[PDB]
Design a protein around this ligand. Structure first.
Ligand SMILES: N[C@@H](Cc1c[nH]c2ccccc12)C(=O)O
Length: 350
């Protein structure tokens, strides 16, 4: 037959697993589950639905996280499209996949369950309600993360939705620090958007949430001021990261900078921060993006062999021949590289 989406993505994952030394059986089984009805869909058919997961609407994005003294972590972000694809049908299918995997792995989901009704709506707003992250490592069983849309009941309701969800979980003080002292003056739900509310599927020993903010048309000065509410972050290091990844850009007026905040029990400041540069918006092509990411990995004492092998695993195409393979690069206070499936489109060089 013609190639399917599964044919393309399953091959990418199999090769990425070898690069990371992760066992491929369970990851490839989980990707097939996550794809649902998209898996068998021919590549020569247009996307089943305009998924926001990736620019070409492939409903999956790969990433490789380089960790100080630990083998790289491979992750898949994506969603399961519904039977007639659509916002509510996609939520049902994605939650169906996750709930089946919770049951299979014997996970407790009481923390996630405790906030379900705050996100639940018959008329979900925006291009998703729930995404899935699958997390793979050498010598660990896969981990599941759930990405909820804070704007699912509309952008206006997002701050109150997040406030009430964090209060229920026994969090809220670090979040209060971010809303009162970490958001650009007069920009909440405007320039500063609540983009993801991310939790482990499995109840951990303590409540933990990763909140992602999108900083529209933002100065690095303002994004690092937002970051400065986090314990022990170096604003200089974040700016250095942004200068290298952005090629000298100070105003990210293309695709926006994104920050994530890790909220934990008993803390009044976030305990973790990541900056996500959408590097595809600030380069001519993937050769230039690869060169910038390699410079960042070298500065951090990482091996560029892992990066080049992960790139080659995803696609053999000349890096000069397009842009957006390297979709994002992020600094965690290690370095994470986000690699596009390009199942539908290779964005041309710019
Ligand atoms: N493709 C979307 C969602 C997304 C995928 N990977 C991401 C990493 C960080 C932030 C957002 C994303 C975007 O670029 O916005």
């Amino acid at each position: 037959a013609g190639l399917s989406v599964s044919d393309h993505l399953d091959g990418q994952l199999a090769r990425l697993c070898e690069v990371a030394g992760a066992d491929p059986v369970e990851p490839r089984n989980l990707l097939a589950g996550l794809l649902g009805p998209v898996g068998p869909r021919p590549l020569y058919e247009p996307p089943a639905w305009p998924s926001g997961v990736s620019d070409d609407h492939t409903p999956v994005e790969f990433s490789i996280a380089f960790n100080e003294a630990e083998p790289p972590t491979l992750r898949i972000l994506g969603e399961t499209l519904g039977s007639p694809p659509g916002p509510l049908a996609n939520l049902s299918a994605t939650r169906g996949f996750l709930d089946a995997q919770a049951r299979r792995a014997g996970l407790s989901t009481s923390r996630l369950d405790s906030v379900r009704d705050l996100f639940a709506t018959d008329d979900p707003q925006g291009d998703f309600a729930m995404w899935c992250s699958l997390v793979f490592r050498s010598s660990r069983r896969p981990e599941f993360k759930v990405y909820l849309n804070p704007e699912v009941k509309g952008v206006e309701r997002s701050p109150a939705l997040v406030s009430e969800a964090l209060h229920r979980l026994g969090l809220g003080a670090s979040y209060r620090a971010l809303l009162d002292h970490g958001v650009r003056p007069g920009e909440l739900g405007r320039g500063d958007r609540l983009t993801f509310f991310a939790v482990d599927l499995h109840d951990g020993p303590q409540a933990r949430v990763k909140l992602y903010l999108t900083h529209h048309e933002a100065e690095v000065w303002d994004v690092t001021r937002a970051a400065s509410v986090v314990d022990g972050v170096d604003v200089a290091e974040i700016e250095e990261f942004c200068v290298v990844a952005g090629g000298g850009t100070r105003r990210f007026d293309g695709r926006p900078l994104v920050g994530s905040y890790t909220f934990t029990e008993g803390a009044d400041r976030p305990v973790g921060y990541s900056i996500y540069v959408p590097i595809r918006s600030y380069v001519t092509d993937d050769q230039e993006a690869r060169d910038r990411v390699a410079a960042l990995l070298v500065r951090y004492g990482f091996d560029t062999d892992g990066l080049d092998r992960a790139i080659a695993a995803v696609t053999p195409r000349p890096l000069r021949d397009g842009v957006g393979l390297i979709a994002h690069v992020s600094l965690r206070l290690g370095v994470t590289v986000y690699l596009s499936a390009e199942a539908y489109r290779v964005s041309p060089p710019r």
